[PDB]
Amino acid sequence: FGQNFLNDQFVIDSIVSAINPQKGQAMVEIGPGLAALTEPVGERLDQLTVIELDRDLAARLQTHPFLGPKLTIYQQDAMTFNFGELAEKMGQPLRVFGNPPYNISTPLMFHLFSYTDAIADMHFMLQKEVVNRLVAGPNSKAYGRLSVMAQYYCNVIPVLEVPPSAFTPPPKVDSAVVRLVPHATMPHPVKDVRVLSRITTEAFNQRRKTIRNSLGNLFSVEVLTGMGIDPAMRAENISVAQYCQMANYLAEN
C-alpha cells in the first residue's frame, strides 16, 4: 500500500507538455491512479493503454465518460507485464510514463531496461533520492549500482522537481519527473550485460572496501592495473565506462 495522487493543474500541464503525447504513438501509463495525467494525456489521443494494480481504480477508469472508449486497461503488477510483447502487438516501441508505486519503482526500471528496443522512452514520477541515484556521477553518495545500469542502458534526464504539496496526500519526500531514453547507440557496448550487472552488484555490496578487496574474486591485481584501474579505489570511484570495460574483460577472457 502507498499511493499519492497529483492534484496540481499547473504541474500536470507541465508534465503533460514535457511528455508531449501525440496521436499515433503507443503510450502506456503505469499507475494512472485517479486519472490526473490520464485525462489530459487521453484527450490528445484516440487510444491509450494503462496498467493499474488497484482493482477499484482500474474499474473506475473503465467507466470514465471520456477515457473509457479510448482505454485498454491491465489490472495487475507492472512487474509481471511483458512490455516487449505489447510493443510487438502495438507494432512500435512504447512511450511509458506515470507514477509507479514506490515499492516497485526500482525493479520496474530494470524490468523495462531489459526490453531495450521495445521502449521508445519513459517519463516517471519518482522519489527524489532515486532520481539522484539514476543520474549520479562517480564520487558521490548517490552513485551506486543503479546509476551504472541505468546509464548503461539509457540517457537519463531529470525533467521537473515536484514538491509534496502537489500531491493528495503529500509524501514524506521530494519527487521528480525523470525522462529515460534507451540509447540509440550504446556509448559503452557490453558483450554480456549479465556480467556488468554482477560486477556492479558485488562491487556495491561492499562500498567502503577497495575494488581489490570487493572483487578480488573476479579480477587479479594485474588485470585491474592492466586496465588502468587503481586497486585502491572504492566502488564510487569507478566510472561507468570503467565498469563496462571490466565487464567486457570478463566476457572476453
Ligand SMILES: [Cl-]
Ligand atoms: Cl475521477
Ligand SMILES: [Cl-]
Ligand atoms: Cl545502489
